[PDB]
Amino acid sequence: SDEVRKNLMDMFRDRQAFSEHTWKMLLSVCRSWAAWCKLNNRKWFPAEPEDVRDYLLYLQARGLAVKTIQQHLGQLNMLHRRSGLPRPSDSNAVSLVMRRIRKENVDAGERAKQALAFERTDFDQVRSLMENSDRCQDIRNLAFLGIAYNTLLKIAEIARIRVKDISRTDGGRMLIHIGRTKTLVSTAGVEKALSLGVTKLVERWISVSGVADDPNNYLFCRVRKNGVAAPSATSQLSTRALEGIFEATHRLIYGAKDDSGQRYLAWSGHSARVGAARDMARAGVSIPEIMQAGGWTNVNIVMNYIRNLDSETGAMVRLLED
Amino acid sequence: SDEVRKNLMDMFRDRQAFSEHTWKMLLSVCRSWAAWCKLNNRKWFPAEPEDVRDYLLYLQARGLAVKTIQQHLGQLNMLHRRSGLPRPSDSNAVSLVMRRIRKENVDAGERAKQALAFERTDFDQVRSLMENSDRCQDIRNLAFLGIAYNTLLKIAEIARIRVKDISRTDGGRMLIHIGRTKTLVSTAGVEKALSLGVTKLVERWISVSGVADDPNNYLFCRVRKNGVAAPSATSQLSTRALEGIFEATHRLIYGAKDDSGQRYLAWSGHSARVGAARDMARAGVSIPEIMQAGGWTNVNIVMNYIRNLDSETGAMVRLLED
Amino acid sequence: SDEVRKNLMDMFRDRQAFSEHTWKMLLSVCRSWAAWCKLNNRKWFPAEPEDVRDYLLYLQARGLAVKTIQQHLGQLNMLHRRSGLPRPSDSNAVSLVMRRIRKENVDAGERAKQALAFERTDFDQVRSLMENSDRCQDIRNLAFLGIAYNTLLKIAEIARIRVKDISRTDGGRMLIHIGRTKTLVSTAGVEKALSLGVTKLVERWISVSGVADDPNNYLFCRVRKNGVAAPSATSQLSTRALEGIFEATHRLIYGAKDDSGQRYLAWSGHSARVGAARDMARAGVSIPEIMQAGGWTNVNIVMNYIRNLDSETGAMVRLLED
Amino acid sequence: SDEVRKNLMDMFRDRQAFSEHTWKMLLSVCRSWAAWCKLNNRKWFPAEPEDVRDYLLYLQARGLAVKTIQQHLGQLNMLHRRSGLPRPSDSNAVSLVMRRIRKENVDAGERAKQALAFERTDFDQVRSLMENSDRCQDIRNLAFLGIAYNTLLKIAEIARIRVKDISRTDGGRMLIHIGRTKTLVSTAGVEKALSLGVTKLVERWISVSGVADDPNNYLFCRVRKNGVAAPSATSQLSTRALEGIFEATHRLIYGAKDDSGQRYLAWSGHSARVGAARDMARAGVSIPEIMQAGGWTNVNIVMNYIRNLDSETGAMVRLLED
DNA sequence: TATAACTTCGTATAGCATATGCTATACGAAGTTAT
DNA sequence: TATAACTTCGTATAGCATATGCTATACGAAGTTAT
DNA sequence: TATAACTTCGTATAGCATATGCTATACGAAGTTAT
DNA sequence: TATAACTTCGTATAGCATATGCTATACGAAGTTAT
Query: Whole-angstrom Cα distance, residue C50 to residue C94?
Result: 7
Q: What is the DSSP secondary structure assignment for residue B305, as one 8-state letter?
A: H
A320 falls within a domain: no
Q: What is the largest CA-CA distance in chain B?
A: 74
Which amino acid is located at C109 in the chain?
A: G
Which chain A residue has its CA at the smallest distance from B150's CA? A316
How many angstroms is C1' of E21 away from CA of B65? 17
Q: With a 7 Å cutoff on the CB, does C268 touch strand H?
A: yes
| A306: region left, alpha or beta (phi > 0 left; psi from -120 to 50 alpha) | alpha
Q: Tell which strand H nucleotides have any atom below 7 Å from a protein Cβ.
A: 3-29, 34-35
Q: What is the DSSP secondary structure assignment for residue D48, as one 8-state letter?
A: P
In this structure, the answer to whether residues D284 and D158 fall within a common structural domain is yes
Query: Whole-angstrom Cα distance, residue B113 to residue A229?
Result: 68
Q: At what angle do helices D120-130 and D271-283 cross, to 10 degrees?
A: 120
Report helix, strand or coil for C228: coil
What count of other Cβ atoms lies within 10 Å of the Cβ of residue D45? 15
Cβ proximity of A271 and A288 under 8 Å: no
C195 touches chain B (CB under 8 A): yes
- C-alpha torsion sign, points D241, D243, D246, D247: negative
Q: What radius of gyration, in Å, describes the C-alpha atoms of chain C?
A: 24
Q: What is the DSSP secondary structure assignment for residue C162, as one 8-state letter?
A: B
Stretch (H or E) spanning C247: helix C239-254
Query: Whole-angstrom Cα distance, residue A222 to residue A240?
Result: 12
Report helix, strand or coil for D257: coil
| D261: region left, alpha or beta (phi > 0 left; psi from -120 to 50 alpha) | left
Which amino acid is located at C283 in the chain?
A: A
User: Is C120 close to B319, i.e. CB distance below 8 A?
Assistant: yes
How many angstroms is C1' of H9 away from CA of D274? 28
Report helix, strand or coil for A190: strand
In this structure, the answer to whether residues B162 and B51 fall within a common structural domain is no
In this structure, the answer to whether residues D286 and D152 fall within a common structural domain is yes
C212 falls within a domain: yes
- C-alpha torsion sign, points A251, A253, A256, A262: negative
Q: At what angle do helices B92-107 and C2-13 cross, to 10 degrees?
A: 20
Cis peptide before D46 (omega within 30 of 0): yes
The residue out of C55, C89, C111 marking a domain boundary is C111
Nucleotide nearest to A66 (CA to C1'): E13
What count of other Cβ atoms lies within 10 Å of the Cβ of residue D315? 19
- C-alpha torsion sign, points D294, D300, D306, D310: positive
Residues 37-96 in D having a C-beta less than 7 A from any atom of strand G are 70-71, 74, 77-78, 81
Strand runs labelled E in A102-254: 166-168, 174-178, 190-193
CATH code of the domain covering residue C37: 1.10.150.130
Query: Helix-strand-coil percent breakdown of chain C, rounded to 5?
Result: 60, 5, 35
Q: What is the DSSP secondary structure assignment for residue A229, as one 8-state letter?
A: B
B320 falls within a domain: no
Cβ proximity of D204 and D144 under 8 Å: no
CA distances from A281 to A285, A304, B298 (A): 6, 11, 16
Q: Which residues pair with B191 in a beta bridge?
A: B177
D197 falls within a domain: yes
- C-alpha torsion sign, points B76, B80, B85, B86: positive
> How big is chain B, counted in residues?
322
A272 falls within a domain: yes
The residue out of A111, A140, A163 marking a domain boundary is A111
Strand runs labelled E in chain D: 166-168, 174-177, 191-193, 222-223, 229-230
B319 falls within a domain: no
Report helix, strand or coil for B59: helix
Cis peptide before B46 (omega within 30 of 0): yes
In this structure, the answer to whether residues D96 and D131 fall within a common structural domain is no
Cis peptide before A46 (omega within 30 of 0): yes
State residue B193 phi and psi, 5-degree precision: -110, 145
A15 falls within a domain: yes
Closest CA to D52 of D28, D76, D31: D76
How many angstroms is C1' of E13 away from CA of A68? 6
Report helix, strand or coil for A233: coil
Which amino acid is located at B253 in the chain?
A: I
- C-alpha torsion sign, points C226, C232, C234, C235: positive
Closest CA to C270 of C102, C157, C177: C157
Cβ proximity of B72 and B29 under 8 Å: yes
B151 touches chain A (CB under 8 A): yes
Dihedral angle over CA of D98, D101, D106, D112, nearest 10: -70
Closest CA to A47 of A32, A63, A65, A66: A32
Contacts of residue D318, defined as CB under 8 A and 6 or more positions apart, other chains included, come to none
Q: What is the largest CA-CA distance in chain A?
A: 76
Closest CA to C301 of C276, C268, C266: C276
D319 falls within a domain: no
Stretch (H or E) spanning B12: helix B2-13
What count of other Cβ atoms lies within 10 Å of the Cβ of residue D164? 13
The residue out of A111, A140, A174 marking a domain boundary is A111
Cis peptide before C46 (omega within 30 of 0): yes
In this structure, the answer to whether residues B107 and B19 fall within a common structural domain is yes
- The CA angle A55-A56-A60, to the nearest 5 degrees, is 115
Query: Whole-angstrom Cα distance, residue B20 to residue B16?
Result: 8
In this structure, the answer to whether residues D34 and D126 fall within a common structural domain is no
Nucleotide nearest to B64 (CA to C1'): F12
In this structure, the answer to whether residues B199 and B165 fall within a common structural domain is yes
| C28: region left, alpha or beta (phi > 0 left; psi from -120 to 50 alpha) | alpha
Quote the domain boundaries for residue A73: 1-111
In this structure, the answer to whether residues D128 and D254 fall within a common structural domain is yes
CA C117 to mean position of chain CA atoms: 14
Query: Whole-angstrom Cα distance, residue A175 to residue A162?
Result: 12
Query: Whole-angstrom Cα distance, residue D174 to residue D163?
Result: 11
CATH code of the domain covering residue B249: 1.10.443.10
In this structure, the answer to whether residues C163 and C299 fall within a common structural domain is yes
CA distances from A260 to A115, A116, A263, A264, C163 (A): 16, 16, 9, 11, 67
In this structure, the answer to whether residues B239 and B281 fall within a common structural domain is yes
Residues 297-316 in D having a C-beta less than 7 A from any atom of strand H are 297, 301, 304
Could you say which residues from 258 to 287 on chain B have a Cβ atom under 8 Å away from some Cβ of chain A? 276, 279-280, 283, 285-286
Split into its structural domains, chain B has a count of 2
In this structure, the answer to whether residues D50 and D182 fall within a common structural domain is no
Nucleotide nearest to C264 (CA to C1'): H26
Q: Which DSSP string do the residues of D139-207 spell out, in sequence order?
A: HHHHHHHHHHHHH---HHHHHH-BGGGEEE-STT-EEEE-----SSSS-S--EEE--HHHHHHHHHHHH
Closest CA to D51 of D90, D93, D95: D93
Query: How many Cα atoms within 13 Å fall on the side-chain side of residue D273?
Result: 21
Strands D174-177 and D191-193: antiparallel
Spell C168-182 as b/e; 16+ CB within 10 A means b.
Answer: ebeeebbbbbbbbee
This structure's resolution (angstroms)?
Answer: 2.2
Report helix, strand or coil for C216: coil
Query: Whole-angstrom Cα distance, residue B51 to residue B6?
Result: 25
Cβ proximity of B45 and B33 under 8 Å: no
Closest CA to D196 of D161, D150, D154: D150
Q: Which residues pair with D218 in a beta bridge?
A: D162
Residues 83-112 in C having a C-beta less than 7 A from any atom of strand H are 87, 89, 95, 98-99, 102, 106
Report helix, strand or coil for A174: strand
Cβ proximity of B308 and C167 under 8 Å: yes
In this structure, the answer to whether residues D306 and D248 fall within a common structural domain is yes
Query: Whole-angstrom Cα distance, residue A293 to residue D315?
Result: 7
